[PDB]
Every structure is written in C-alpha cells, then in structure tokens.
Design a binder for this molecule. Sequence first.
Ligand SMILES: Nc1ncnc2c1ncn2[C@@H]1O[C@H](COP(=O)(O)OP(=O)(O)OC[C@@H]2O[C@H](O)[C@@H](O)[C@@H]2O)[C@@H](O)[C@H]1O
Length: 183
Amino acid sequence: DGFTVLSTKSLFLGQKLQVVQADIASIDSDAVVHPTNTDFYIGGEVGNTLEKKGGKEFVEAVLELRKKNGPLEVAGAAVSAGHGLPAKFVIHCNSPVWGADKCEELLEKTVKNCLALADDKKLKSIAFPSIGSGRNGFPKQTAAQLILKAISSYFVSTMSSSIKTVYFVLFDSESIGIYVQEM
Ligand SMILES: Nc1ncnc2c1ncn2[C@@H]1O[C@H](COP(=O)(O)OP(=O)(O)OC[C@@H]2O[C@H](O)[C@@H](O)[C@@H]2O)[C@@H](O)[C@H]1O
C-alpha cells in the first residue's frame, strides 16, 4: 500500500491533524513515532515495520541511542536519526501497557512528550501510530481517542510551536474499521 486521507481536523491555530491510512514507515514526515519500552526493544508492530523498511541502519541508530540515553523512563520520548527511512527522525516513546495503573493518563502524557520533543527540534510535521494498541494491548478505540485528545490538548495550551501538521496513521483493519464506523 498505499495512502488515503480519512479525516482532517483543525487544531487550535489551524494546524492540521490528519487521520490517514498508510504504513507509517512509508510516511516522509520530519518525525515518525516508534512505540517501544524502557530497553528500546524494537519488537512491536511499528518497530517491526520500521526495521523492515530501514534495516540495519535503523537498528544501529536505536542501539546508539540506547547507549547514549540509557533506559527510557516512563512516558519518556527520545529521538534518533531516521536512517534507512523517509522520515527525517524517529521519536521513540515508552508506551504504557494496557492494565498497568494510570495507563490512560500515561498514554496522553507520552504523546505530549513526543510533541514537545518535535517542537524542541523545530520539526514541522510528526506522525503517530496508535501507540499502545498493538503489543501493549490497548483497545484500538481507547488508544486512538486518548491520542487524538492528547494532540488537541497540546495545541490548545502550547502558544507556539513549529508543528504545522500531525498525522495519525492507521494501518490495521480493525483500527481503520472502528475509526470510520465510529465517526
Ligand atoms: N505499518 C504500520 N503503520 C502504522 N501502524 C501500524 C503498522 N503496523 C501495525 N500498526 C499498528 O500500530 C499500533 C501500535 O502497535 P505496536 O507498534 O505494537 O505498539 P504498542 O502496542 O505500543 O507496543 C509495542 C512495544 O514494543 C516493545 O516491543 C514492547 O515492549 C511493546 O509491546 C497498533 O494499532 C498496530 O495495529
């Protein structure tokens, strides 16, 4: 595949939130978001697609980041170069596990931290997948509404802010099916 725009929303200053159907690895935004864990394990669904696309270049960048950063703190966001990928940078986030205490709040928090990091690097665009709803077990709709809520909230409260466009990237048929059905 593949690229379809499914929904577009105006954020607080008219910045655009686009929900799109695509493989996130194929998106050429300034940043793409990789949901990972404290050890930067590259074995979630999105991690596997980034590794498929970027190969060794991608993996060694993640390793170098783990060595420089140390373990990724709860809800933490960190950035590596997008070697092997269309995206300029990869923002790595410590994705909460469904069922862990305060897991919804932490999902919101991690999203905002990814946005702050992109802003700190003066990035114009950032692509999020449905963080938490793969290997970490969130229900797809719950994950998606938390992420979209957290992006909107960021832009209401952030004065500015270099981000022009936010992509919310859906790939699995269940997520797409529920997004479209329930909207
Ligand atoms: N090519 C793709 N593009 C965009 N989204 C995709 C793609 N493939 C799958 N997805 C969707 O990405 C969402 C996030 O899933 P994961 O990447 O598995 O992320 P998460 O559930 O947060 O957890 C992965 C994490 O990686 C570590 O190995 C592990 O500690 C943790 O489980 C899911 O809805 C999944 O269907």
